[PDB]
Design a protein around this ligand. Structure first.
Ligand SMILES: Nc1nc2c(ncn2[C@@H]2O[C@H](COP(=O)(O)OP(=O)(O)OP(=O)(O)O)[C@@H](O)[C@H]2O)c(=O)[nH]1
Ligand SMILES: Nc1ncnc2c1ncn2[C@@H]1O[C@H](COP(=O)(O)OP(=O)(O)CP(=O)(O)O)[C@@H](O)[C@H]1O
Ligand SMILES: COc1ccc([C@H]2[C@H](CO)C(=O)N2c2cc(OC)c(OC)c(OC)c2)cc1O
Ligand SMILES: Nc1nc2c(ncn2[C@@H]2O[C@H](COP(=O)(O)OP(=O)(O)O)[C@@H](O)[C@H]2O)c(=O)[nH]1
Ligand SMILES: [Ca+2]
Ligand SMILES: [Ca+2]
Ligand SMILES: [Mg+2]
Ligand SMILES: [Mg+2]
Ligand SMILES: [Mg+2]
Lengths: 424, 439, 317, 62
């Protein structure tokens, strides 16, 4: 059945995870009570990828909700589809993690992880052919970043031949909780380079700009940013939740998207940017989707080259005109694709559009311009660490300056690796 | 009478299998429930169609096929489809998880654990054979199963049946209808491993068929159904000699003998005409001489290449329908002059011809129009080395950076099997040059 | 807007076709090895034809004809006229193919006076056969230009488009040894820029050794009471037609997955009886200096933009 | 242009037409490789579980 186990950790991880289940449950006919009231069986054909069946033939998300304080979880429970979720699958502690990676990864997190892995284990064993795991979390806080990457290390240990995929939100000064965010995020990126197969870099800087100078919102809330994440997460998983010529699964996606095992951080993209009754034409989907202004990761992709790309158009449109329009923008912009990976841009079409759009296009890009992101964090990181500032919050939890130097070092390698393929 | 066992590996091999076995039933008049009214010898026989079908006491005619796929999704559709009552449940073999477009994961990792079961299921067919000839193996070059498990199966088949012929129908990979960026990798890999175990391999380039479906059936986006129903006609022409009364190409050894002098050079170029849209309102039926000239246009080959620029080693013409030899040697006579047809010096410039008077069958409702005469040409020309050159360049671009190699090594392969397989293809490209061009 | 790549960097004329192309604001150049092009300007040697015409949504055009070396390599050019029935033919010198086929045996059946020539000149067989390459009779009685008593050859440029229309460039060039003609001593026997820019006073009786068409017609009028059309160009158009119509079925790209055009350089000799002779065909010719602009533009007009349209100077044959 | 072995029958005809004339590895060797790959897989996994085990004793030291 190739089931996926979804895990959402921390504040940012549980709010975007909560929106994800809202969006795709509507796409699959499942109402807030877990009952299915849809019209096509395309909705139910591949529905066991993300849902377990119930006794009343209801549907329950294969979702585990993890936090080190309950504040967000009871709010998820009180929110829209909150009662869709398996009540045992709420795993949480009380002390919080203080926007502190060490507390999530080493002290408070370690106290809670085994109970999390018991739910993982329970959810995993029911699966006929589990493909792997999908984690939603931010990297700038403490639970989603520190505990999140701890969970990933343990899962890799228990399930080393399953696929680990994450949706990982990147801190940005423009949308910032605390100044130690670059510390937490440098530490998590080291974990993600080693222990995930595919990571989607959702940048909070990009979501803000899109929300400001495009969706024409002058002061965007987190709900505006998370609306954009809902849409990308729905689209990036369309080929997984719906049947097609493509038999897309997590392992095949990694095989075809990742030429080099460390370079597996994807820039997602979306069109049209929702926040409208004239559907976009296929040349609009194509031009917009590839515009700098439609990337969720805040790198101009004209600054580096695409190793690989995977795109889906949702709606009822000219399959051929897609191919025509794709191959156009490629051969109008062939300066930003690598000439040494034949046929590295792949396209799909799906007849089911998402709610409130007749035409949409999601884009997954493995571009070397994502080095702009890691450079950005690496600069913010060194700016503090050179004066050892704010470190006491970490050395008081056990960590040595050593562990920081290595994470700084391993991430600057990541930026070097990405740079050597920009020129080839 | 001597039996032939068909083996369908992967998605491409199974779905084309379905396309062929449906056509075989329409051609020999076998109903979806296995019954064959015209067959009067109930429960046995040594007829020509018995080479492909066995018979049960209750009168059912049962394919001598085995279907294998590392995942269940596609063979499951045979399990419930219009011909569920056709096959023995034991003939449809599916695993748990597929080979994730990875040669090394279909060969080494997942492959090693279904291989003994499949051979045991094939053995139960071999045991139903009074004098088995060998095997017809259908697969993609590009899938992980299709490339990786097949070369594992072709290895053991040489071991369990060293004295049996093995024929290949191979789907070569085309971008404008494709599924993985690493198909060039799996292509080279499986070709290197499978070579010495296959006596004759018919390569179908998916771009050729796709363009043929676009140009001649006027279909904008050809489906796999469109692609496969046309591939069936060509496979039915090639196999017709084994399932029907005839004196040309009557056993698998005759395919080696007639088309394969040099054994490494065993990839005969197929050409086929006419392809005619069934929604073509008014159509002027084409002549023997017309459909034989088509056999020399690139746009009708199963692999786009320019045979004017290599040398032929053999040519076979297989007609289906209203054809007589007078019509044929006339058309040959005229084409010999006006076209560049150059054999190798150590080979006779000539054609072996065969005519089955039954005109081609079409799937009712499908996209191909019924015709009164068709032909399939099988020419062992050296211009098919263009398709190796193409594949080998695409492999060279990626492998110079080692892109995606880690996914193979991750399964137990060594980088060396990559440069060993490419060194083999570089030889095979050179052999073709030693035979096809002059200083 | 269209896509082209460049893969013969030191091509005299296609360097300028590639430059005019950029300058129209409608053609983007790529790296050599980028396979997403509309138009190759390929390698002289080993152009990879087997990889053309396999890019979805890409119409591909190349500036060479696979198989055109049948005409240009002087070894196979002789074999072609001897072997091809369309070329019985009495405008090609008597020629034989010989190796360090071959035809040394019947090479002497005609030897009862004989003087010949060979490279890739003598009157006795030994002097040249020690080169152990084709053997032609030497034009002992060529036409002479006065004052000067000069030999010369004629370079006509011929363009064949993707449809196999044969286009003769209106402008041609005479390339004369601007020194008197003798008999034996080997300077004015080979008259071009390969025994004249180093060995041979290099531009005496005219300019650049290059007498262009308008002048030569005028000479023929006053000096012979005839014209360049009647006395010579008819036979040239006959020879151009005959060669290219001969190989057309071997090299045509009419029903092919890519398409070819190619520019050729035919070289002719005229004798004293005003009869025209074919010397050899050049698959990669360079143009005469002052004509580049008009011809390199005419290429892009009828060979390049003909296929890839945007927003005469030839004679059809 | 000659014609040889003309073969008629009830289903059709077959013949030849000339225009000019002319001038395996063992099971054990398999098992070897197939198991020298599984060992390479198991080695790579043991190195993974060893690096993970070291992470545990770092998590325990912090
Ligand atoms: N002509 C034709 N080609 C097919 C068909 N199905 C898949 N292909 C081609 O085969 C290649 C993909 O290999 P598959 O057969 O799908 O792979 P597989 O054997 O199922 O192996 P896995 O990787 O385990 O799924 C691509 O070139 C596809 O274009 C088909 O039904 N007809
Ligand atoms: N049959 C002939 N009669 C008279 N002169 C001849 C001749 N064949 C060659 N020549 C002389 O040789 C010269 C022509 O050179 P040619 O056209 O054969 O080029 P080439 O041998 O250098 C090969 P390429 O030009 O491609 O490098 C002329 O000046 C001409 O006088
Ligand atoms: C870069 O080359 C490839 C990328 C992905 C794949 C398949 C690959 C095989 O089907 C897989 O998985 N792809 C894929 C997956 C997606 O999400 C699951 C997509 O968007 C929602 C998608 O859009 C095309 C594709 C195949 C390739 O050849
Ligand atoms: N896009 C988005 N970012 C968030 C959200 N909530 C928090 N963040 C960001 O996440 C980081 C803080 O992580 P958080 O989840 O609050 O801490 P945690 O609970 O300890 O993991 C900061 O970069 C915030 O900008 C959200 O709902 N959406
Ligand atoms: Ca505590
Ligand atoms: Ca019977
Ligand atoms: Mg917070
Ligand atoms: Mg499959
Ligand atoms: Mg010259």
């Amino acid at each position: 059945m190739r089931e996926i186990v979804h895990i959402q950790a921390g504040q940012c991880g549980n709010q975007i995870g909560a929106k994800f289940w809202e969006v795709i449950s509507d796409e699959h006919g499942i109402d807030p009570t877990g009952s299915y009231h849809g019209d096509s069986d395309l909705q139910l054909e591949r529905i066991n990828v993300y849902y377990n069946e119930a006794t009343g033939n209801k549907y329950v998300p294969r979702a585990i909700l993890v936090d080190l304080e309950p504040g967000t979880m009871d709010s998820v429970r009180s929110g829209p589809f909150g009662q869709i979720f398996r009540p045992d699958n709420f795993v949480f502690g009380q002390s919080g993690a203080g926007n502190n990676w060490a507390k999530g990864h080493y002290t408070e997190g370690a106290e809670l992880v085994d109970s999390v892995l018991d739910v993982v284990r329970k959810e995993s064993e029911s699966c006929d052919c589990l493909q792997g795991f999908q984690l939603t979390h931010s990297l700038g806080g403490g639970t989603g970043s520190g505990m999140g990457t701890l969970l990933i290390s343990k899962i890799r240990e228990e399930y080393p031949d399953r696929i680990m995929n994450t949706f990982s939100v990147m801190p940005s000064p423009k949308v910032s909780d605390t100044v130690v965010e670059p510390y937490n995020a440098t530490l998590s990126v080291h974990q993600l380079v080693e222990n995930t197969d595919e990571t989607y870099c959702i940048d909070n800087e990009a979501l803000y700009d899109i929300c400001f100078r495009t969706l024409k919102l002058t002061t965007p809330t987190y709900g505006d940013l998370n609306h954009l994440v809902s849409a990308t997460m729905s689209g990036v998983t369309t080929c997984l939740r719906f049947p097609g010529q493509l038999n897309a699964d997590l392992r095949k996606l990694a095989v075809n998207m990742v030429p080099f095992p460390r370079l597996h951080f994807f820039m997602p993209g979306f069109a049209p940017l929702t926040s409208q009754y004239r559907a976009l034409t296929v040349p609009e989907l194509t031009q917009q989707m590839f515009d700098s202004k439609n990337m969720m990761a805040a790198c101009d992709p004209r600054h580096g080259r695409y190793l690989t790309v995977a795109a889906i158009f949702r709606g009822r449109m000219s399959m051929k005109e897609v191919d025509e329009q794709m191959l156009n923008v490629q051969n109008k912009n062939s300066s930003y694709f690598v000439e040494w990976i034949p046929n590295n841009v792949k396209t799909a079409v799906c007849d089911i559009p998402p709610r409130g759009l007749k035409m949409s296009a999601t884009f997954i890009g493995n571009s070397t311009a994502i080095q702009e992101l890691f450079k950005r964090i690496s600069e913010q990181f060194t700016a503090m660490f050179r004066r050892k500032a704010f470190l006491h919050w970490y050395t008081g939890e056990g960590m040595d300056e050593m562990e920081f130097t290595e994470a700084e070092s391993n991430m600057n390698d990541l930026v070097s690796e990405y740079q050597q393929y920009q020129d080839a | 009478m001597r039996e032939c066992i068909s083996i369908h590996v992967g998605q491409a091999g199974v779905q084309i299998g379905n396309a062929c076995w449906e056509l075989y039933c329409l051609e020999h008049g076998i109903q979806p429930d296995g019954q064959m009214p015209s067959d009067k010898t109930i429960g046995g026989g040594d007829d020509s169609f018995n080479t492909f079908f066995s018979e049960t006491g209750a009168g059912k005619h049962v394919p001598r096929a085995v279907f294998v796929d590392l995942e269940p999704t596609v063979i499951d559709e045979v399990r419930t489809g219009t011909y569920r009552q056709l096959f023995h449940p034991e003939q449809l073999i599916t695993g748990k998880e597929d080979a994730a477009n990875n040669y090394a994961r279909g060969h080494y990792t997942i492959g090693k654990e279904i291989i003994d079961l499949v051979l045991d299921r094939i053995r139960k067919l071999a045991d139903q054979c009074t004098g088995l000839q060998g095997f017809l193996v259908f697969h993609s070059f590009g899938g992980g199963t299709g490339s990786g498990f097949t070369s594992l199966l072709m290895e053991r088949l040489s071991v369990d049946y060293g004295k049996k012929s093995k024929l290949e129908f191979s789907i070569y990979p085309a971008p404008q209808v494709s599924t993985a960026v690493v198909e060039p990798y799996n292509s080279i890999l499986t070709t290197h491993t499978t070579l010495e175990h296959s006596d004759c391999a018919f390569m179908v380039d998916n771009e050729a068929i796709y363009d043929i479906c676009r140009r001649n059936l006027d279909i904008e986006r050809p489906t796999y159904t469109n692609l496969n129903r046309l591939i069936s006609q060509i496979v039915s022409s090639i196999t017709a000699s084994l399932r029907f009364d005839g004196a040309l190409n009557v056993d698998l050894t005759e395919f080696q003998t007639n088309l394969v002098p040099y054994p490494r050079i065993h990839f005969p170029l197929a050409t086929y005409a006419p392809v005619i849209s069934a929604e073509k309102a008014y159509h002027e039926q084409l002549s023997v001489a017309e459909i034989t000239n088509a056999c020399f246009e690139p746009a009708n080959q199963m692999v786009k290449c320019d045979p004017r620029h290599g040398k032929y080693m053999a040519c076979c013409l297989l007609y289906r329908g209203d054809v007589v030899p007078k019509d044929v040697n006339a058309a040959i006579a005229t084409i010999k002059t006006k076209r560049s047809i150059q054999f190798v010096d150590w080979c006779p410039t000539g054609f072996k011809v065969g005519i089955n008077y039954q005109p081609p069958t079409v799937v009712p409702g499908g996209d191909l129009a019924k015709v009164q005469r068709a032909v399939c040409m099988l020419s062992n020309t050296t211009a098919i080395a263009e398709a190796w050159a193409r594949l080998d360049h695409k492999f060279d671009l990626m492998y110079a950076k080692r892109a995606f190699v880690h996914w193979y090594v991750g399964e137990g392969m060594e980088e060396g099997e990559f440069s060993e397989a490419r060194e083999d293809m570089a030889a095979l490209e050179k052999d073709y040059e030693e035979v096809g061009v002059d200083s | 807007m269209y896509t082209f790549v460049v893969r013969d960097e030191n091509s005299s004329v296609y360097a300028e076709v590639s430059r005019l192309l950029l300058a129209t604001g409608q053609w983007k150049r790529l790296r050599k090895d980028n396979p997403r092009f509309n138009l190759m300007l390929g390698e002289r040697n080993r152009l990879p034809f087997g990889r053309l015409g396999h890019e979805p949504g890409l119409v591909q055009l190349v500036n060479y004809y696979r198989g055109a070396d049948k005409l240009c390599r002087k070894a196979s050019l002789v074999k072609l006229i001897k072997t091809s029935p369309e070329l019985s033919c009495t405008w090609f010198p008597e020629s034989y193919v010989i190796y360090p086929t071959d035809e040394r045996e019947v090479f002497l059946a005609a030897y009862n006076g004989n003087v010949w020539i060979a490279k890739s000149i003598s009157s006795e067989a030994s002097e040249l056969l020690d080169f152990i390459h084709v053997i032609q009779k030497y034009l002992e009685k060529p036409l002479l230009l006065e004052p000067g008593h000069r030999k010369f050859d004629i370079r006509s440029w011929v363009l064949v488009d993707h449809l196999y229309n044969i286009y003769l460039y209106r402008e041609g060039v005479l390339r004369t040894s601007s020194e008197p003609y003798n008999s034996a001593d080997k300077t004015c026997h080979l008259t071009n820029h390969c025994i004249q820019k180093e060995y041979s006073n290099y531009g005496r009786y005219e300019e650049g050794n290059e007498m262009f068409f308008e002048e030569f017609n005028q000479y023929l009028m006053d000096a012979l009471n005839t014209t360049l059309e009647n006395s010579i160009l008819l036979q040239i158009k006959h020879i151009i037609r005959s060669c290219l119509m001969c190989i057309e079925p071997a090299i045509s790209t009419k029903h092919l997955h890519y398409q070819s055009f190619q520019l050729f350089g035919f070289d002719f000799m005229v004798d004293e009886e005003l009869k025209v002779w074919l010397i050899e065909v050049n698959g990669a010719p360079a143009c005469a200096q002052k004509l580049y602009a008009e011809l390199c533009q005419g290429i892009v007009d009828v060979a390049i933009s003909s296929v890839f349209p945007l927003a005469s100077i030839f004679i059809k044959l | 242009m000659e014609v040889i072995e003309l073969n008629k029958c009830t289903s059709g005809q077959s013949f030849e037409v000339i225009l000019k004339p002319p001038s395996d590895p063992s099971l054990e060797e398999i098992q070897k490789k197939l198991e020298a790959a599984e060992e390479r897989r198991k080695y790579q996994e043991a190195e993974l579980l060893k690096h993970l085990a070291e992470k545990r004793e770092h998590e325990r030291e912090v």
